[PDB]
Amino acid sequence: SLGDKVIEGYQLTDNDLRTLLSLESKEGLERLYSAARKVRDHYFGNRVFLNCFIYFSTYCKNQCSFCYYNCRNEINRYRLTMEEIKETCKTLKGAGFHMVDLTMGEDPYYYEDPNRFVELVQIVKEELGLPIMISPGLMDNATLLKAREKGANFLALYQETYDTELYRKLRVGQSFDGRVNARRFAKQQGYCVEDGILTGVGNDIESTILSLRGMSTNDPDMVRVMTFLPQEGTPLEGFRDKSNLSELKIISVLRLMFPKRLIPASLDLEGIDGMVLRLNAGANIVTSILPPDSQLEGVANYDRDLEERDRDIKSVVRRLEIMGMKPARQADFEAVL
Ligand SMILES: C[S@+](CC[C@H](N)C(=O)[O-])C[C@H]1O[C@@H](n2cnc3c(N)ncnc32)[C@H](O)[C@@H]1O
Ligand SMILES: C[C@H](CCN)[C@@H](N)C(=O)O
Ligand code: SF4
């Protein structure tokens, strides 16, 4: 009945969030996943959207405590040349993606002269013609406006948490309202916006509710949750979370809270097997799919130690077929834009 109630317009209360978020039993969790699939199937059927991830520069000037690419970490870093971007684009044409996500750290090269980023968006839009999600960090409003004019469609700029006590330990040195304000500015210029929270990073149930309610206030087009994977060389490298607040539970709660929105199943956390679990918890778009071949990186990189990664669209679509799901039509995706 819970899925039916939501389909009809029921708004989950804070008591409902507490109850859903504290579910621990196999049967309870299966009833929560089933409810979220009812809601997702009502609005999306068995059709799934596919987003390619192009991490085009792994340089960052910021010092996030959770992220492998924080500026204090002495690691391998790359910055794709124009020729490498064009070669990557050639491998994506006609592959079946609905959108491409052009992501970078806050790379000083692109921040010193943001016309270099605007030209990168123009080249990719000219090559692919597809909807483009940008994840450039907190770029200034003038650059956001120029990138919109070159064909950027989505801005992904995740808040991580709306619990202020936690945000300042995670996004060290970054304004809390700066990110909120940039998503608002981008919506005014016509972008769709994705917000996101991290779980497994010391958020308890109350912190998670504050973050779910914080995400809803701004009317995002896409909402996500990622499991924190502690990374080598960061301040949080040893962190162990003592919580039941799994990404799958929160995906189902997001579907019940944002029934009509996009919610990702990311390959970056648990790969294709993890994708199955996330789609069965209510997700409707598969992200962190890499270009065919590709030495390109994800962000959490659950598969950093594997001799062979399984991140390509053809493996994703094969697994959706096994699940009884199918890629969506492009026009259905464009309807969200
Ligand atoms: C793809 S965005 C990068 C864009 C730009 N640098 C930024 O911070 O907005 C990185 C996000 O990846 C996720 N992330 C980073 N490190 C992670 C980790 N160790 N585990 C899980 N998610 C992580 C976070 O939600 C952070 O918002
Ligand atoms: C975190 C990344 C996305 C950033 N906008 C990508 N690895 C993902 O999981 O979708
Ligand atoms: S999350 Fe984004 S801003 Fe923070 S260190 Fe990682 S790449 Fe840089």
Swiss-Prot record:
What's one Pfam family here? Answer: Radical_SAM
> What pathway or pathways are given for this protein in its record?
Amino-acid biosynthesis; L-pyrrolysine biosynthesis
Q: What is its EC number?
A: 5.4.99.58
A Gene Ontology molecular function term for this protein is: transferase activity
- What PROSITE patterns does this protein map onto? RADICAL_SAM
Keyword field? 4Fe-4S, Amino-acid biosynthesis, Iron, Iron-sulfur, Isomerase, Metal-binding, S-adenosyl-L-methionine
Q: Please, which domain of life does this record's source organism belong to?
A: Archaea
| Domain Radical SAM core intervals | 46-268
How the cofactor is bound: the record states: Binds 1 [4Fe-4S] cluster. The cluster is coordinated with 3 cysteines and an exchangeable S-adenosyl-L-methionine. Binds 1 S-adenosyl-L-methionine per subunit.
Q: Which residues bind [4Fe-4S] cluster?
A: C60, C64, C67
Q: Which InterPro entries match?
A: Aldolase_TIM, Elp3/MiaA/NifB-like_rSAM, HydE/PylB-like, Pyrrolys_PylB, rSAM
- Which positions does UniProt annotate for S-adenosyl-L-methionine binding? F66, E160, R171, R179, L229, Q231
Which EC class heads this enzyme's classification? isomerase
- Keyword Metal-binding listed? The answer is yes
Q: Which reaction does it catalyse?
A: L-lysine = (3R)-3-methyl-D-ornithine
Q: Which example biological process does GO assign this protein? A: pyrrolysine biosynthetic process
Sites binding (3R)-3-methyl-D-ornithine sit at: D101, S135, Y158, R224, S266, T287, S288
Q: Which cofactor does it need?
A: [4Fe-4S] cluster; S-adenosyl-L-methionine
Function summary: Catalyzes the isomerization of L-lysine to (3R)-3-methyl-D-ornithine via a radical-based mechanism, a step in the biosynthesis pathway of pyrrolysine. Also catalyzes the reverse reaction in vitro, converting (3R)-3-methyl-D-ornithine into L-lysine.
Family listed: Belongs to the radical SAM superfamily. PylB family.
Protein name from the UniProt record: 3-methylornithine synthase
Q: Which organism is it from?
A: Methanosarcina barkeri (strain Fusaro / DSM 804)
